[PDB]
């Protein structure tokens, strides 16, 4: 049994890659698309909310407000449905329309900003909305320690247990930097020799080249006006990148060859991982790729 | 470790779907548990039947590495087959009309399916199906409507999971029907282990074939039969009664489940759940343990 969909968050499957040539290393994909909200962001939605509740920051009529690229809004929408909280999301109009439709299916109210101004414009508009709300809580995923902490506590522990502590490499897409940073932090505390790499869009190479740009790898990229506080760059053994088209193409390779329907960021992160494997061919490495969301919302 | 989720392929993710208790919607003093078949990696219960139909055919020798799998279907069965065939490297052709959603067409194509489009009735699909058979040296047609591996998969897995998760404490099972396989396979097994259990199929109120002997238009995707006729895999001798749901109520309940429970099920989940609520209300405060099958997740209908 589960008492609610909240009990289904986490404990996601880790699936071996069998048909794609992985160059004498084993690649496993952690399917965060299996979460009830269809993304890893269910984990951070749950922890940011539950810790706020414990700290006395959320009453039953507190309005939760958050700027999001989409999946955090979906995870929050779903949790707020179960908990009967009111959620308002500020988001860019440039994201997949399926994100909006998913949030609205859970009863979430969406306010739209100009996508060409990035997540900075969402964070700005959220300040304006605060003035009309008598009682609110802003999870603030780009600074809230409970974003990476969720991954440190659950995601990483699931990887360690499922692979019985045999993990050589962990590769993960970045937006807030929380899933990479929290998971890599725990992994490195237990496995001192593990290598952990973040991936960013080749068209918005903030970490590897020092500038941003438009890209199509939804959920990835840093557009708040700097590197998020929750990103811990000291954990990165190197910065990996992926082009927009290669991400789309790899997303299709995964579905055609593995029956894995991941998002565009999954295509990006997996491409980066497969390239890494090719560069480190025939070492018998156990390589784990975080698939941040499922692909249904991008078709 | 023993309670971990390491998987060899997405095939290992099929089945073992969770039961979730309903807490916020009034269920009238009975306990309603929804079995979320949307948790399957192809997002519906049809992964179970796609898996069993293909694997039994492999075992029979009906599928060689170069056998083309061919099925005339516009629904979740096509998706389930597509995903399975992606993993197993079989060529799949799915025949469906001109007039179907890009939603499902694109999902099937994402797994590598050749979707062949005809003119929208089903009669024109069958002639294309016959034409493709004639063009292929080797083929296998699963035929979800006649293949006993449809209900057998549910008899073997779906029903056993329900018994295990509720420690054999199940009073009522309610399930939407299209092929009738999930209802008939699951109810068969549950009744063998639990002789007092009541088992009810649900059909669309505006296509009440089983309850009133005719077909009509409805919007409960995945449910409903054709004439055509009642599929071979439906076993009406298991049905304690036939329940129905109108289109409007199915959509409303779909919305209610996502708003109040954070459960995003398909239209048939709304229909089946509405039928179970109407049943639970006629039997209020009996502490009945009622299981509803949620056949797919709701994303594709948004
Ligand atoms: C948020 C998100 C990411 C990046 O994850 P972070 O933990 O924020 O760095 C990648 N892909 C998708 C689809 C996302 O929603
Ligand atoms: C196939 C399907 C049904 C009906 O299930 P059967 O086992 O064919 O009777 C109900 N809902 C959806 C979404 C389906 O795809
Ligand atoms: Ca240590
Ligand atoms: Ca190092
Ligand atoms: Ca390119
Ligand atoms: Ca009551
Ligand atoms: Ca045999
Ligand atoms: Ca193929
Ligand atoms: Ca193909």
């Amino acid at each position: 049994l589960a008492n609610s969909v909240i009990d289904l968050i986490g404990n996601t499957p880790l699936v071996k890659i069998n048909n794609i040539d992985t160059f004498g290393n084993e690649i496993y994909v952690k399917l965060e698309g299996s979460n009830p909200g269809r993304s890893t962001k269910d984990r951070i939605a749950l922890k940011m909310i539950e810790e706020a509740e414990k700290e006395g920051l959320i009453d039953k009529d507190t309005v939760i407000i958050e700027a999001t690229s989409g999946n955090t809004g979906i995870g929050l929408a779903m949790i707020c449905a179960v908990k009967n909280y009111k959620l308002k999301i500020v988001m860019p109009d440039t994201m997949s329309i399926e994100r909006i439709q998913l949030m609205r299916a859970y009863g979430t109210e969406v306010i739209l900003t100009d996508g060409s101004l990035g997540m900075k414009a969402c964070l700005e508009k959220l300040e304006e909305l605060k003035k009309n709300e008598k009682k609110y809580f802003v999870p603030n995923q780009f600074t809230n320690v409970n974003n990476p902490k969720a991954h440190y506590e659950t995601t990483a522990e699931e990887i360690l247990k499922d692979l019985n502590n045999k993990v050589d490499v962990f590769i993960c897409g970045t937006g807030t930097g929380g899933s990479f940073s929290g998971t890599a932090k725990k992994l490195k505390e237990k496995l001192p020799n593990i290598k952990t790499f973040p991936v960013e869009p080749a068209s918005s190479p903030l970490l590897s080249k020092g500038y941003i740009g438009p890209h199509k790898i939804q959920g990835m990229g840093m557009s708040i006006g700097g590197i998020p506080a929750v990103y811990d760059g000291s954990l990165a053994d190197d910065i990996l990148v992926c082009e927009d088209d290669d991400a789309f193409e790899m997303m299709r390779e995964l579905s055609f060859k593995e029956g894995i329907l991941g998002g565009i960021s999954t295509g990006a992160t997996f491409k980066a991982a497969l390239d890494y494997s090719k560069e480190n061919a025939d070492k018998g490495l156990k390589i784990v790729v975080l698939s941040t969301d499922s692909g249904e919302k991008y078709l």
Side-chain angles (χ1 to χ4, degrees), chain A residues 69-89:
Chain A
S69 60
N71 283 320
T72 300
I74 296 163
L76 284 174
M78 184 194 75
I79 301 312
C80 290
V82 172
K83 285 175 177 290
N84 190 38
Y85 299 147
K86 168 70 173 182
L87 179 65
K88 300 185 185 190
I89 287 307

mmCIF file of all heavy atoms in Angstrom, chain A residues 69-89:
data_model
loop_
_atom_site.group_PDB
_atom_site.id
_atom_site.type_symbol
_atom_site.label_atom_id
_atom_site.label_comp_id
_atom_site.label_asym_id
_atom_site.label_seq_id
_atom_site.Cartn_x
_atom_site.Cartn_y
_atom_site.Cartn_z
ATOM 1 N N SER A 69 10.957 26.395 -14.258
ATOM 2 C CA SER A 69 11.032 26.092 -15.690
ATOM 3 C C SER A 69 9.957 25.071 -16.037
ATOM 4 O O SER A 69 9.639 24.870 -17.193
ATOM 5 C CB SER A 69 12.437 25.572 -16.090
ATOM 6 O OG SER A 69 12.772 24.377 -15.390
ATOM 7 N N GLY A 70 9.411 24.412 -15.039
ATOM 8 C CA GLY A 70 8.257 23.563 -15.254
ATOM 9 C C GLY A 70 8.187 22.437 -14.293
ATOM 10 O O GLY A 70 7.185 22.293 -13.593
ATOM 11 N N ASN A 71 9.241 21.609 -14.230
ATOM 12 C CA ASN A 71 9.098 20.386 -13.453
ATOM 13 C C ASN A 71 8.996 20.630 -11.977
ATOM 14 O O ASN A 71 8.248 19.910 -11.287
ATOM 15 C CB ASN A 71 10.175 19.343 -13.790
ATOM 16 C CG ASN A 71 9.882 18.638 -15.094
ATOM 17 O OD1 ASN A 71 8.717 18.320 -15.377
ATOM 18 N ND2 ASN A 71 10.913 18.420 -15.911
ATOM 19 N N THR A 72 9.711 21.631 -11.462
ATOM 20 C CA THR A 72 9.512 21.956 -10.040
ATOM 21 C C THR A 72 8.059 22.375 -9.800
ATOM 22 O O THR A 72 7.456 21.927 -8.840
ATOM 23 C CB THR A 72 10.514 23.000 -9.513
ATOM 24 O OG1 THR A 72 11.837 22.470 -9.685
ATOM 25 C CG2 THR A 72 10.289 23.238 -8.011
ATOM 26 N N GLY A 73 7.509 23.184 -10.697
ATOM 27 C CA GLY A 73 6.071 23.537 -10.642
ATOM 28 C C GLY A 73 5.142 22.352 -10.662
ATOM 29 O O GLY A 73 4.180 22.313 -9.915
ATOM 30 N N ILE A 74 5.457 21.357 -11.487
ATOM 31 C CA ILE A 74 4.665 20.099 -11.512
ATOM 32 C C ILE A 74 4.748 19.288 -10.242
ATOM 33 O O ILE A 74 3.725 18.815 -9.685
ATOM 34 C CB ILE A 74 5.060 19.225 -12.740
ATOM 35 C CG1 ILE A 74 4.692 19.962 -14.019
ATOM 36 C CG2 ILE A 74 4.354 17.856 -12.674
ATOM 37 C CD1 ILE A 74 5.375 19.429 -15.278
ATOM 38 N N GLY A 75 5.969 19.103 -9.752
ATOM 39 C CA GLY A 75 6.164 18.411 -8.466
ATOM 40 C C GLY A 75 5.464 19.081 -7.285
ATOM 41 O O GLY A 75 4.769 18.440 -6.499
ATOM 42 N N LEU A 76 5.623 20.382 -7.205
ATOM 43 C CA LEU A 76 4.896 21.208 -6.219
ATOM 44 C C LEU A 76 3.355 21.130 -6.404
ATOM 45 O O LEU A 76 2.596 20.940 -5.437
ATOM 46 C CB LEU A 76 5.401 22.638 -6.332
ATOM 47 C CG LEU A 76 6.764 22.950 -5.714
ATOM 48 C CD1 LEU A 76 7.142 24.363 -6.069
ATOM 49 C CD2 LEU A 76 6.777 22.724 -4.235
ATOM 50 N N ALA A 77 2.905 21.180 -7.647
ATOM 51 C CA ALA A 77 1.450 21.113 -7.947
ATOM 52 C C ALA A 77 0.859 19.833 -7.418
ATOM 53 O O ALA A 77 -0.181 19.812 -6.703
ATOM 54 C CB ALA A 77 1.213 21.287 -9.434
ATOM 55 N N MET A 78 1.552 18.743 -7.700
ATOM 56 C CA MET A 78 1.120 17.428 -7.261
ATOM 57 C C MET A 78 1.107 17.265 -5.750
ATOM 58 O O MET A 78 0.142 16.728 -5.204
ATOM 59 C CB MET A 78 2.008 16.334 -7.889
ATOM 60 C CG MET A 78 1.560 14.927 -7.539
ATOM 61 S SD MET A 78 2.791 13.684 -7.935
ATOM 62 C CE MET A 78 3.884 14.045 -6.554
ATOM 63 N N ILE A 79 2.176 17.715 -5.085
ATOM 64 C CA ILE A 79 2.245 17.675 -3.632
ATOM 65 C C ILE A 79 1.174 18.576 -3.020
ATOM 66 O O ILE A 79 0.548 18.188 -2.045
ATOM 67 C CB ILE A 79 3.624 18.124 -3.060
ATOM 68 C CG1 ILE A 79 4.792 17.257 -3.574
ATOM 69 C CG2 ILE A 79 3.637 18.078 -1.545
ATOM 70 C CD1 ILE A 79 4.516 15.813 -3.456
ATOM 71 N N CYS A 80 0.986 19.763 -3.576
ATOM 72 C CA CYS A 80 -0.034 20.683 -3.070
ATOM 73 C C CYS A 80 -1.454 20.150 -3.266
ATOM 74 O O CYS A 80 -2.331 20.409 -2.446
ATOM 75 C CB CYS A 80 0.134 22.073 -3.695
ATOM 76 S SG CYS A 80 1.616 22.934 -3.102
ATOM 77 N N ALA A 81 -1.682 19.383 -4.327
ATOM 78 C CA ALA A 81 -2.962 18.697 -4.524
ATOM 79 C C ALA A 81 -3.246 17.763 -3.374
ATOM 80 O O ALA A 81 -4.327 17.830 -2.781
ATOM 81 C CB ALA A 81 -2.977 17.930 -5.853
ATOM 82 N N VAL A 82 -2.262 16.924 -3.035
ATOM 83 C CA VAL A 82 -2.399 15.939 -1.963
ATOM 84 C C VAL A 82 -2.591 16.635 -0.631
ATOM 85 O O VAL A 82 -3.401 16.209 0.179
ATOM 86 C CB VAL A 82 -1.170 15.020 -1.845
ATOM 87 C CG1 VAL A 82 -1.249 14.138 -0.615
ATOM 88 C CG2 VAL A 82 -1.042 14.177 -3.091
ATOM 89 N N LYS A 83 -1.832 17.697 -0.411
ATOM 90 C CA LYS A 83 -1.856 18.379 0.881
ATOM 91 C C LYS A 83 -2.979 19.426 0.999
ATOM 92 O O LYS A 83 -3.160 20.003 2.061
ATOM 93 C CB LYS A 83 -0.492 19.012 1.118
ATOM 94 C CG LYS A 83 0.555 17.968 1.502
ATOM 95 C CD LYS A 83 1.921 18.616 1.612
ATOM 96 C CE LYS A 83 3.012 17.671 2.068
ATOM 97 N NZ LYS A 83 2.863 17.291 3.491
ATOM 98 N N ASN A 84 -3.675 19.692 -0.109
ATOM 99 C CA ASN A 84 -4.678 20.731 -0.212
ATOM 100 C C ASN A 84 -4.097 22.140 0.052
ATOM 101 O O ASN A 84 -4.722 22.944 0.739
ATOM 102 C CB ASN A 84 -5.907 20.409 0.681
ATOM 103 C CG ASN A 84 -7.087 21.346 0.426
ATOM 104 O OD1 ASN A 84 -7.350 21.733 -0.720
ATOM 105 N ND2 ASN A 84 -7.790 21.734 1.503
ATOM 106 N N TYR A 85 -2.931 22.450 -0.527
ATOM 107 C CA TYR A 85 -2.385 23.804 -0.510
ATOM 108 C C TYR A 85 -2.600 24.473 -1.840
ATOM 109 O O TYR A 85 -2.621 23.824 -2.895
ATOM 110 C CB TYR A 85 -0.865 23.861 -0.228
ATOM 111 C CG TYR A 85 -0.408 23.287 1.116
ATOM 112 C CD1 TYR A 85 0.831 22.666 1.246
ATOM 113 C CD2 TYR A 85 -1.174 23.431 2.266
ATOM 114 C CE1 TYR A 85 1.251 22.145 2.455
ATOM 115 C CE2 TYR A 85 -0.757 22.905 3.475
ATOM 116 C CZ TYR A 85 0.476 22.286 3.568
ATOM 117 O OH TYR A 85 0.892 21.777 4.780
ATOM 118 N N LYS A 86 -2.677 25.800 -1.782
ATOM 119 C CA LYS A 86 -2.825 26.626 -2.942
ATOM 120 C C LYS A 86 -1.427 26.940 -3.467
ATOM 121 O O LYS A 86 -0.601 27.449 -2.728
ATOM 122 C CB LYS A 86 -3.543 27.920 -2.522
ATOM 123 C CG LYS A 86 -3.541 29.043 -3.524
ATOM 124 C CD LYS A 86 -4.413 28.669 -4.676
ATOM 125 C CE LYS A 86 -4.584 29.824 -5.624
ATOM 126 N NZ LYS A 86 -5.487 29.418 -6.710
ATOM 127 N N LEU A 87 -1.206 26.709 -4.745
ATOM 128 C CA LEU A 87 0.066 26.971 -5.408
ATOM 129 C C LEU A 87 -0.138 27.898 -6.563
ATOM 130 O O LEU A 87 -1.081 27.716 -7.374
ATOM 131 C CB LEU A 87 0.668 25.650 -5.921
ATOM 132 C CG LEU A 87 2.019 25.715 -6.672
ATOM 133 C CD1 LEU A 87 3.142 26.199 -5.749
ATOM 134 C CD2 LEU A 87 2.369 24.350 -7.234
ATOM 135 N N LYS A 88 0.724 28.907 -6.650
ATOM 136 C CA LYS A 88 0.842 29.758 -7.837
ATOM 137 C C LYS A 88 2.262 29.651 -8.384
ATOM 138 O O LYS A 88 3.227 29.718 -7.625
ATOM 139 C CB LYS A 88 0.518 31.210 -7.503
ATOM 140 C CG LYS A 88 -0.899 31.417 -6.971
ATOM 141 C CD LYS A 88 -1.222 32.897 -6.774
ATOM 142 C CE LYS A 88 -2.607 33.041 -6.136
ATOM 143 N NZ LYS A 88 -3.073 34.464 -6.136
ATOM 144 N N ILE A 89 2.384 29.477 -9.695
ATOM 145 C CA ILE A 89 3.661 29.306 -10.357
ATOM 146 C C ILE A 89 3.862 30.458 -11.278
ATOM 147 O O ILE A 89 2.941 30.848 -11.995
ATOM 148 C CB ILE A 89 3.705 27.970 -11.162
ATOM 149 C CG1 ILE A 89 3.813 26.793 -10.195
ATOM 150 C CG2 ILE A 89 4.813 27.955 -12.211
ATOM 151 C CD1 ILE A 89 4.949 26.880 -9.204
#
